[PDB]
Amino acid sequence: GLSKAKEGVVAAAEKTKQGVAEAAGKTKEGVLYVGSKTKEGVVHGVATVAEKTKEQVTNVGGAVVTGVTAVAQKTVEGAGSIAAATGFVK
Amino acid sequence: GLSKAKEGVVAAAEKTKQGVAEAAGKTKEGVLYVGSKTKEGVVHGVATVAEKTKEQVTNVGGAVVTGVTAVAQKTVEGAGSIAAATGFVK
Amino acid sequence: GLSKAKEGVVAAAEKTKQGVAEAAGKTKEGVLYVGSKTKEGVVHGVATVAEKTKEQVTNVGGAVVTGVTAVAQKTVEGAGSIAAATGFVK
Amino acid sequence: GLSKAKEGVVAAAEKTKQGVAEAAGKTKEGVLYVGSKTKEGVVHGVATVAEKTKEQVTNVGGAVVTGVTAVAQKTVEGAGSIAAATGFVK
Amino acid sequence: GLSKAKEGVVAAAEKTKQGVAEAAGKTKEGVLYVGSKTKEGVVHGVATVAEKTKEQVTNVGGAVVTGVTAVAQKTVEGAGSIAAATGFVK
Amino acid sequence: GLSKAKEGVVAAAEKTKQGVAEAAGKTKEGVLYVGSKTKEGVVHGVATVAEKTKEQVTNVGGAVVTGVTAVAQKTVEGAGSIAAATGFVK
Numbered sequence A, B, C, D, E, F: 001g002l003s004k005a006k007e008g009v010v011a012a013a014e015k016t017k018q019g020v021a022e023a024a025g026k027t028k029e030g031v032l033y034v035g036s037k038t039k040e041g042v043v044h045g046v047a048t049v050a051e052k053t054k055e056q057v058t059n060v061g062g063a064v065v066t067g068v069t070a071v072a073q074k075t076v077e078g079a080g081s082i083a084a085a086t087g088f089v090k
């Protein structure tokens, strides 16, 4: 049983996931040895991310703007009236 | 049983996740030895992130602006009226 | 049983997570030896993050602005009227 | 009389020049005004050089190696036995 | 009479020059005004050099290595036996 | 008579020059006004050099190594036996 990121063993579940990201190297798992070694061994890793990320955001005279939003709800027996990143203009 | 990030063993669950991030190297797990070693061994890792992240945010005369928001609710038997990152203009 | 970040063993749960971050190297777990070693061993790690993060935020004459918000509620049998990062303009 | 780099007025001369370089903008001379100006004037300049110059030099078991050398000599009436960047192997 | 770099007025001369360099902007000369100005004037300059110059030099088991050398001699009536960056191996 | 760097007025001369350098902006000369000005004037300059210059020098088991050397001699009537950056191995 090895789960790197989210779930390994569940009977019932539900999820929501988002990503605005930058990654070089993940997931170096299960490095296990059963036996014998005699002379030499070498392991090596190098990572480099996000070299000069240049970005500009401009918004003039807008009404509604939404960048990132994640909503997840579970109801067994009920009423739900929920909202997120909502904008009312009149 | 090894879960790196979120969940290893659950009977019932629900989650929401977001990321605005930068990462070089994660998840170096399960490095276990069962046996014998004689002469030499070397392990090595290097990480570098977020080299000169240049960014500007500008908003002039706006009405509603929403950058990042995460909402997750669970109800068994009830009424729920919730909100987040909401804006009312009149 | 080893859970690095959030949960290892739960019967029922629910969570919400957010990140605006920068990381070089995480998750070096399970480094356990069962056996014998004779001559030499070396382990090495280097991390570097957040090299000259330059950023500007400007907001002039706005009405509603929301950067980051996380809300998570659980109700068994009840009424809930909650809000966060809300703005009313009239 | 305006000489930017090497010589403006000479009766007798001799020179030697070398360059291993990188340059964006030179030689903005002779900006002189004779007259009148009334309302507005703008002058602007931007320069950027040497973006991530990556280079490696390797030499194994060599005998003679010469990278850069400049020699210039002037004699009126005489004997000259000069040398530079010379290598004798026996 | 304006000489930026080397020589403006000479009767007899001799020189040697070398460069391993990086430059953004030089030579903004002769900015002189003869007259009248009324309302506005702006002058502007920006320079940036040597962005992440990465370099390695390696030499193993060599005999003679010469990187940079400049020699210049002038003799009226005489004998000259000079040397520079020389290597004798026997 | 204005000489920025080396020589403005000489009857007889000789020189040698070298550079391993990095420069953003030089040579802002001759800014002289003859006349009248009424309302406004602005002069501006910005310079930035040597951003993360990373370099390594390695030499193992060498015989002769010469990086930088400059020699210049003048003799009217004589004998000269001079040397620089020389290496004798036997």
Ligand SMILES: *[C@@H]1O[C@H](CO)[C@@H](O)[C@H](O)[C@H]1NC(C)=O
Residues within 6 Å of the ligand: A079, A080, A081, A082
């Ligand atoms: C649910 O939310 C809405 C508004 O979005 C509201 O009008 C309603 O009364 C709430 N409940 C039900 C059962 O509609």
Ligand SMILES: *[C@@H]1O[C@H](CO)[C@@H](O)[C@H](O)[C@H]1NC(C)=O
Residues within 6 Å of the ligand: A079, A081, B079, B080, B081, B082
């Ligand atoms: C839920 O929230 C809404 C407003 O968004 C409100 O009008 C309502 O009365 C609340 N409850 C129900 C059952 O609608």
Ligand SMILES: *[C@@H]1O[C@H](CO)[C@@H](O)[C@H](O)[C@H]1NC(C)=O
Residues within 6 Å of the ligand: B079, B081, C079, C080, C081, C082
């Ligand atoms: C829930 O909140 C809303 C306002 O958002 C309010 O009008 C309402 O009375 C509250 N309760 C119910 C059952 O609606």
Ligand SMILES: *[C@@H]1O[C@H](CO)[C@@H](O)[C@H](O)[C@H]1NC(C)=O
Residues within 6 Å of the ligand: D079, D080, D081, D082
């Ligand atoms: C000049 O230099 C050489 C060696 O390069 C030497 O043999 C000689 O004697 C010197 N002078 C003359 C006149 O040759």
Ligand SMILES: *[C@@H]1O[C@H](CO)[C@@H](O)[C@H](O)[C@H]1NC(C)=O
Residues within 6 Å of the ligand: D079, D081, E079, E080, E081, E082
């Ligand atoms: C000049 O230098 C050389 C060695 O390079 C030497 O043998 C010689 O005697 C010197 N003078 C003359 C006239 O050769």
Ligand SMILES: *[C@@H]1O[C@H](CO)[C@@H](O)[C@H](O)[C@H]1NC(C)=O
Residues within 6 Å of the ligand: E079, E081, F079, F080, F081, F082
């Ligand atoms: C000049 O230097 C050389 C050695 O480089 C030497 O042998 C010589 O005697 C000196 N003078 C003359 C005239 O050669």
